[PDB]
Each structure stands twice: as C-alpha cells, then as structure tokens.
Amino acid sequence: ESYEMTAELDDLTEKIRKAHQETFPSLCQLGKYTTNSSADHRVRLDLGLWDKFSELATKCIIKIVEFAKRLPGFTGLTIADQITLLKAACLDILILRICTRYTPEQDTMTFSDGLTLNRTQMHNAGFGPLTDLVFTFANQLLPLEMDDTETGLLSAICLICGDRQDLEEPTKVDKLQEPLLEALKIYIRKRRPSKPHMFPKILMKITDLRSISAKGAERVITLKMEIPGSMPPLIQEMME
C-alpha cells in the first residue's frame, strides 16, 4: 500500500492540466523581452504601458473563456450561469495567472507575449496602489511550488463555484466543483507525499485572490476614470 487507485480523478486532473497549459503558456516556454518605457520611477499612469496592458488583459480574458469551456460540464451549465461564473471569477484568475509569471530575482512579471515588466512598470501600467500587494501575493506562491496542474485546478475551483449570486442552477455547479476539490486534494498528496498541510494551504489562496480582486474592482473603476479612451468592451462586460 502506498497510494490507492483513482482512475477518473487522474483523468480529470489531466483534462484540466491540459486546458490550463494550452490556454496559458509557461514562463520557461516564453521568449521574454523588456521595454525602456518609464522603467525608472513610479508615475500616475503610463499610457504606452496601459495600451499594451489593456490589450494583453483582453486576450487573457479570451483565454480564460476558452479555458472555462474546456472544463468538463461547464458548457453544460446554462449560458446565463456560464456568464455568471466567469464574471465573478474573472479577476481572481487574471490575478492568479500574472502572479504565476513572477520572476523573483528580477522582480518582474511576464505576459503571454513575453513582455516582461518590473515592479515599477507594473505599477505604471495600471496596478497603481495595488502593486506591492499583488507582488507580495506572488512571492507567497513561490514556496508552494505550484505547477501547471495545481494552477489549473485552483483556477477551475475558483470559477466553478455554486455560491455566486444569480446562479440559476447553483446546485448543478456544486456538483461540478466537488470532483475538482477531490482531484486537487489527491494530486497534492501524490506529489507532496508526507509533506501535508498543503491542501488547505493552497486552497486558502483563493481567499487571498478574492481579497485582491475585490480591491481590484475599484482599481478598474479608478482606471476607467483615468484613461483617455474607453475601457475595452470585453473588460467592461466582465466587470459590469
């Protein structure tokens, strides 16, 4: 006896590791590149950086929709619920994603095009007063040594949540969520054998994301008032 058989959950775990990897390139699998734009000091807002940031955020959201539809059962939920789940968990995942692209030595974050900005540039790009807070969170993920499989499951657990307001079939969502929890609990076990406390420790990161996305919602409003143009339509639909 070492680990018992869990065929279905092993498969589910793979179907989610795949959905994540194929909708979100790993840091090592990216060609990084920097920019000289406002690299030195904190500014109110660098429009050059905002333009690129807003564009990359939009694309990431498109990836998130894609990742959602690749979750077993999601396309089963009503179109209304699918929208409800996405709108509530979109920012949580945007945060989770950019924070798993953190390079601790250069203190930078990397987008899916390879664009790599430092703490100052992330602030100037739109993070504003939430910069140090999000960077703190990033550094708190490192010791956890999460991989693509754990990041995918955590994201799926975040999205597939039956507590969201206005869910038509919230109980149906609950059903889809629990195998994800079991999947995570087990994968962490095989991966980190007798080094536990890790399941609740990782699970509680959703708690951290929720806190940040709540403040994030206000940051978006302040940005909406700060930027010259309009807030990208897909972004507004996710925050409305």
């Binding site: 929709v65 929208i83 639909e237 996710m238 409305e240």
Partner: peptide, 11 residues
C-alpha cells in the same frame, strides 16, 4: 445583454 461574452460562449 452581453454581446461578446455570449458570442464567445456560443462558439
């Protein structure tokens, strides 16, 4: 009510 989110979810 959501033009984009809905189109992406339809296909």
């Amino acid at each position: 009510r959501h033009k984009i989110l809905h189109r992406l979810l339809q296909e």
